Write an enzyme that holds these catalytic residues in place. Sequence first.
Site, mmCIF file in Angstrom:
data_model
loop_
_atom_site.group_PDB
_atom_site.id
_atom_site.type_symbol
_atom_site.label_atom_id
_atom_site.label_comp_id
_atom_site.label_asym_id
_atom_site.label_seq_id
_atom_site.Cartn_x
_atom_site.Cartn_y
_atom_site.Cartn_z
ATOM 1 C CG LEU B 14 -26.523 1.449 -5.120
ATOM 2 C CD1 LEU B 14 -26.874 1.032 -3.694
ATOM 3 C CD2 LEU B 14 -25.116 2.023 -5.197
ATOM 4 N N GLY B 15 -27.701 -0.908 -8.868
ATOM 5 C CA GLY B 15 -27.906 -2.052 -9.732
ATOM 6 C C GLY B 15 -29.298 -2.024 -10.313
ATOM 7 C CD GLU B 16 -30.451 0.361 -14.167
ATOM 8 O OE1 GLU B 16 -31.630 0.764 -14.059
ATOM 9 O OE2 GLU B 16 -29.656 0.814 -15.020
ATOM 10 C CD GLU B 21 -35.584 1.163 -11.359
ATOM 11 O OE1 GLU B 21 -36.394 0.447 -11.981
ATOM 12 O OE2 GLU B 21 -35.942 2.119 -10.637
ATOM 13 C CG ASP B 129 -27.464 -16.449 -6.559
ATOM 14 O OD1 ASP B 129 -26.552 -17.248 -6.902
ATOM 15 O OD2 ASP B 129 -27.831 -15.514 -7.297
#
EC number: 2.7.11.1
Lengths: 10, 270
Positions: B14-16, B21, B129
Amino acid sequence: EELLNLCSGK
Amino acid sequence: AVPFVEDWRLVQTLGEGAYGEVQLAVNRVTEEAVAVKIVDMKRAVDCPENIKKEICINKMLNHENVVKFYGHRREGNIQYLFLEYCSGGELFDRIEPDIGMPEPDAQRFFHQLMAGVVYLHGIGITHRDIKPENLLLDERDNLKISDFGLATVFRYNNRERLLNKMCGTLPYVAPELLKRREFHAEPVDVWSCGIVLTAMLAGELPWDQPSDSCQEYSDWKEKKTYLNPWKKIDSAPLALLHKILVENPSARITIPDIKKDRWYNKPLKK
Ligand SMILES: [Zn+2]
């Protein structure tokens, strides 16, 4: 981990 | 008690980040999908304390518009955080550039964002954020605030501390964060929500930086709402935005008064 000190409120 | 891969089939990254990760994992026996944040505990010396704080904060979270935390496990020097999977992806990808999205969809999403943020503020947590890339959608397009890697506790038992750390993402940060040495957390989060609403309604960010040295921000302070993005926004949500994107945080609208706003309460035909 330490809510009484507001975390990094230290 | 079992190696990670034996209980979990990894489907997709999904993301890194420098962290490690985030993976989509499916349970081999229950077939349930879960997002798993994977942190290599050997990267950077501050890794133990930061992840301790993030785990503690995630243990505090219990709201339908906040990504749920299922638990944590560690194998060697690899730490796993198991999280609710949001198959609809980023709110960011629902925003058509220079267009946005239908006003009723933006209102619904903004309602859900406000529910999540006011929940967090009620328990003393600030996310710090808030932006469409950190707002995820579940399979029914319900919004969930995600990634508490920057979050902290600003208030507990009615004792509040001012923040001073510079964090977030410039187009979303409140101006007092640039201008003041210390600031209250809640108006900062409210400001970033207003930027998110602007992006949903118009498909573009109003300014790269909330600074007088940024031309578009000066235009907003001069009420030049015949310019983009404001020209694309109906006057009812624009009046709400006029109350949120207020430079002085002590004069900025609070979430209780956002809940009283006329557009916020307007039934919208889809
Ligand atoms: Zn804590």
